[PDB]
Amino acid sequence: NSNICEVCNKWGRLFCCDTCPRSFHEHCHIPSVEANKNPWSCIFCRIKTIQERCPESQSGHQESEVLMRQMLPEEQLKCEFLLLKVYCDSKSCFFASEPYYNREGSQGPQKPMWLNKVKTSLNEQMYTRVEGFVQDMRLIFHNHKEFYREDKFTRLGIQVQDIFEKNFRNIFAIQETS
Template identity: 30%
Template sequence: MYVFADGDKNGVETDPQKDDPNEDWCAVCMDGGEVVVCCDKCPKVFHQMCHIPKLAAIPDENETWQCLLCTNLKEIIDAPPTSPVESRGQGLCSKDQKVAERLLLELYCQYEPSLHFREIVGPEVKEYYSVIKKPMALDVVRRKLDPVDPEHYSTIREFIADIRLIFRNAYIFNPKESQVFQDAKSLEEFFDSLLEKWLPAYAYDVEAGSDDDSLDNQPHRKYRRILSE
């Protein structure tokens, strides 16, 4: 495991002539500044606070460290149910917590398509709030995944519903030909492909209803609606 910043690895200047298997930029924020931690199983690097879950401490340079993207999620999913992680109330079991963290990290690592959906639209965009009544963003989902957050998810269904809400809001507010709409569609298709592998019961499998006016602008495809009205 390497920890480095701005061309420096383990306190030693790197040789530009040598092949470096690791990427230059944090996989989440695409910034190379400050200290980044290199995964020992893939080329990705992460800032301590960018990785999901955030790293409690920078690993020792002699430790072997792998990012959550390299974790064998099937082993986690196939494991027996576990008790909820420590939180202020009833929360996700450890297995669901890990699956949700993996799904969210995968979305963040789709850097360009996810950029529009990381932060809540600012209140100064009054037109947005006249149309969208329940704003949602990846950063909010990440906060609610923290076991100590007062709004920590109680079920994996709640987590997936918030992710769906991000895409639904994008479809409602943005024209179909817009880049935001297309990025939402691409990112949701990617999200569904992950659900098919790890949580198939929550992947798309039902035709989107046309009786709800707020859904008219959504792309024509099949998916499982778990949003609460």
């Protein structure tokens, strides 16, 4: 197995996947690495299994249909994986913890949002449909772009949103378009 965490790229107390060479810190994996379970398969392996059991799940889908799906176990897992893919980018640090807003010429957002809040919300089964999760994720980046205005720091929001959106289209097999 790898000797660094797949998500944060650091060593430490790592848990190894039994079905692939990836490794994880306990709370870097989503959901948090399960207590017992031998063997244990990581979320990458669990996602690959869903795909393998239902090859047709990779055919193109409309975003509108995906968003309305209820958060049954497979859609729960897909949103956990998508959140984990955003944490995999180092730029996610800017959006992880609770933000605060005190900049001359800007006002903070009406509804602040951050990754760890979305993580807790998933863990607590607070989303009933994929749409709830996707709306909170997109709100993170929208708040950032609106608050930072013309500061070049707005680009970090565009960058991490692009990681989100690419992974959303991949994981949920959104129909390819120009």
